[PDB]
Design a protein around this ligand. Structure first.
Ligand SMILES: CCCCCCCCO[C@@H]1O[C@H](CO)[C@@H](O)[C@H](O)[C@H]1O
Ligand SMILES: CCCCCCCCO[C@@H]1O[C@H](CO)[C@@H](O)[C@H](O)[C@H]1O
Length: 504
């Protein structure tokens, strides 16, 4: 049973919590929390989890948001089990083969113990208590050992659980025999094609593993033999973390318009990578059975799903039996004013706007559509007295974070990039978001993308978004209307409750 110790619900949180709880108690399979940025979606989720008293899985679109959510839930539920099911995939290199460079890359070995420790802490809690909230990136949902074996194998002071998720040795001996049978069939496949390099590679690698398994009960990359350990038939879905949860667990897909497509595309993405290792003889075809689930398989293994997003995608909108909105922010801050400005003199207009703001301690974010434009605009702004940096698309998560962190701390005043839909860009000091080529085609100028971009100006009491365009596209029109709908609802709530916005 959960014990919430966070802030009491404010703004639209009370009504949203009640609407979600009511739909779930009524048996709705799919429900959406349509929550604007800054409305406190984590507290809403927390209160729903508390009310229903069922273990929960929260999936995030990337490792940064996953870690952040885990940290927040930990603070909100200090006496319960908050777990982070991290994957080595997030920070270390997996096994891979790059054909174009005829390059084989070994998986990183002897990694930071904290990774495996977090995964085991997750599975141990799921088997010992019901007050568990597990946060993970979607990528973490992959093949994992049989929960039955993991559960049945314990030592009893203190109950000690396994040190690995791939126990199930059944008859290691009969298991090793079945793997070797596949090996020689596959070697014959290569020999018949004249591909003796592939046959040799597969033989050496597989026989090495079989010997290490025989003399150690395990080997590096043992997960590749998952199917043999779990007894699953070829092509059948593998066991995953979902199987370690009690049957009535609740699933939240945060940033659902991003996570649902990630869940839909995971199987194919992984298949392309693994199939390559198989085609060149590094792995047996059975390695393809240690994989992510297809979206349909994932849906068969969950019972109720809450999609959370400020801009729900097509799946959520077609399938949800209820949509609950949360628009009013606990802080009372308003969605920004959105202006449309001509392209003539747009750069001089923008530079004047940026310097006016920098003079009073306010920051500006700018999105453009090409790398040449981003490079050139950034240099132009710097030559004209502005502390501007360019958020290059090749920066990795840490680098982006460091660069963004420096804006949050005020080292510079303006960040220019192509894709601003990055984590950490919700900074109170940002009072202007400028969107060049606002009317042009492309993912970053879609109705949803514009709404998400506009939201980066919603943490400041004077936030504005400037759309440079000489025409209004349907995406611009609908994003401006939605921003205005939200702002008006927020102003009405503030006027009823005697609240005047302020920047923190
Ligand atoms: C388990 C190991 C079995 C080894 C037997 C390999 C028989 C090879 O098979 C032969 O290979 C030739 C060259 O690739 C082809 O031209 C022939 O068509 C093919 O039958
Ligand atoms: C309030 C948050 C709005 C986010 C943008 C939502 C855009 C939805 O767009 C709508 O989707 C429907 C079904 O998917 C279609 O039938 C409509 O024709 C389409 O306009």
């Amino acid at each position: 049973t959960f014990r919430y110790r966070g802030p009491s619900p404010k703004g639209d949180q009370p009504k949203a919590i009640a609407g979600l709880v009511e739909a779930l108690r009524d048996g709705e399979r799919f429900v959406t929390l349509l929550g604007a940025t800054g409305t406190g979606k984590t507290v809403t989720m927390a209160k729903v989890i508390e009310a229903l008293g069922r273990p929960a899985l929260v999936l995030a679109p990337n490792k940064i948001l996953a870690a952040q959510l885990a940290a927040e839930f930990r603070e909100l539920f200090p006496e319960n089990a908050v777990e982070y099911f991290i994957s080595y995939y997030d920070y270390y290199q997996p096994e891979a083969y790059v054909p174009g460079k005829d390059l084989y890359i070994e998986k990183d070995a002897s990694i930071n113990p904290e990774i495996e420790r977090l995964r085991h802490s997750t599975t141990r809690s799921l088997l010992t208590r019901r007050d568990v909230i597990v946060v993970a990136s979607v990528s973490a949902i992959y093949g994992l050992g049989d929960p039955r074996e993991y559960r049945a194998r314990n030592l009893v002071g203190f109950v000690l659980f396994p040190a690995t998720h791939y126990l199930s040795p059944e008859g290691l001996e009969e298991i090793l025999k079945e793997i070797e049978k596949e090996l020689w069939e596959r070697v014959r496949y290569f020999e018949e094609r004249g591909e003796v390099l592939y046959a040799q590679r597969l033989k050496e690698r597989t026989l090495y593993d079989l010997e290490m398994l025989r003399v150690m009960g395990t080997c590096p990359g043992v997960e590749n033999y998952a199917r043999y350990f779990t007894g699953k038939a070829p092509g059948e879905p593998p066991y995953t973390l979902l199987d370690y949860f009690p049957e009535d667990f609740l699933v939240f897909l945060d940033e659902s318009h991003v996570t649902v497509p990630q869940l839909q595309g995971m199987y194919r993405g992984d298949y392309a990578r693994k199939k390559t290792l198989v085609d060149y003889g590094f792995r047996l075809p059975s390695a393809l059975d240690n994989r992510p689930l297809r979206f349909e398989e994932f849906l068969e293994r969950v019972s109720q799903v809450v999609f959370v997003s400020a801009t729900p995608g097509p799946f959520e909108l077609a399938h949800s039996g209820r949509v609950v909105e949360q628009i009013i922010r606990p802080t009372g801050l308003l969605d920004p004013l959105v202006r449309v400005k001509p392209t003539e003199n747009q750069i001089l207009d923008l530079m004047e706007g940026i310097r006016e703001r920098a003079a009073r301690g306010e920051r500006t974010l700018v999105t453009v559509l090409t790398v040449r434009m981003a490079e050139e605009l950034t240099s132009f702004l710097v030559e004209h007295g502005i502390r501007a940096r360019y958020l290059h698309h090749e920066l990795d998560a840490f680098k982006r974070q460091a660069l963004i962190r420096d804006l949050r701390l005020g080292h510079y005043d303006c960040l220019v990039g192509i894709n601003l839909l990055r984590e950490g860009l919700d900074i109170p000091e940002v009072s202007l978001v400028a969107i060049l080529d606002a009317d042009k085609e492309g993912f970053l100028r879609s109705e949803r993308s514009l709404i998400q971009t506009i939201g980066r100006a919603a943490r400041n009491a004077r936030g504005e978004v400037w759309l440079y365009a000489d025409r209004v596209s349907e995406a611009m029109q609908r994003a401006i209307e939605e921003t205005n709908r939200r702002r008006a609802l927020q102003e009405a709530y503030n006027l009823e409750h005697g609240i005047t916005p302020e920047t923190v």
